[PDB]
Amino acid sequence: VVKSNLNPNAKEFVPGVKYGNI
Amino acid sequence: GPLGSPLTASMLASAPPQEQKQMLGERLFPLIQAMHPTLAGKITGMLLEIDNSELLHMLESPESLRSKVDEAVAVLQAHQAKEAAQKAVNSATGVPTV
């Protein structure tokens, strides 16, 4: 698969909701 | 929304604070916008899972920020690399030499 280096959750940009929030 | 033609910096001015996740995401697109020559668009995406408290700190830390997105630019180069080398493989694979 496509493993990232910076973020461990490299996922596309899905607006509308605060992606990466708690 | 419909103003996806211009830049994201322009969106910032035309996008309320709640529009964070929309335009700049956290604060990604704007920083990589300077590093757009690569593919800022998709970069922000993967690294969108970044903190919101860190997003603000990034815009205040040119050294600490650019360092992070520095790798971000690399995630792209590798993104299109491991993607094209899927079925278009001509060279042989690695041998099980233990």
Structural domains present in chain B: 1-98 (1.10.1900.10)
To which H or E segment does residue B63 belong? helix B62-79
Sequence-distant (6+) residues with CB within 8 A of A14 are: B48
**Cα angle B49-B71-B94, degrees, rounded to a multiple of 5:** 105
Distance CA B18, CA B4 (A): 17
- Tell whether B56 is within 8 A of chain A (Cβ): no
Cα distances (Å, whole numbers) of residue B16 to B13, B30, B61, B77, B78: 8, 15, 23, 32, 34
Residue A20 to residues A17, B43, B77, Cα–Cα distance (Å): 9, 14, 23
Residue B2 phi, psi (nearest 5)? -75, -20
Rounded-to-integer distance, Cα B39 and Cα B35, Å: 8
Contact residues on chain B for A10, CB-CB shorter than 8 A: 46-47, 49, 75
The DSSP-derived string for B29-41 is: HHHHHHTTTT-HH
Chain A residue with minimal CA distance to B76?
A4
**Beta carbons of B44 and A13 less than 8 angstroms apart:** yes
B47 in contact with A, Cβ within 8 Å: yes
Comparing C-alpha atoms, which of B28, B49, B26, B25 is closest to residue B38? B28
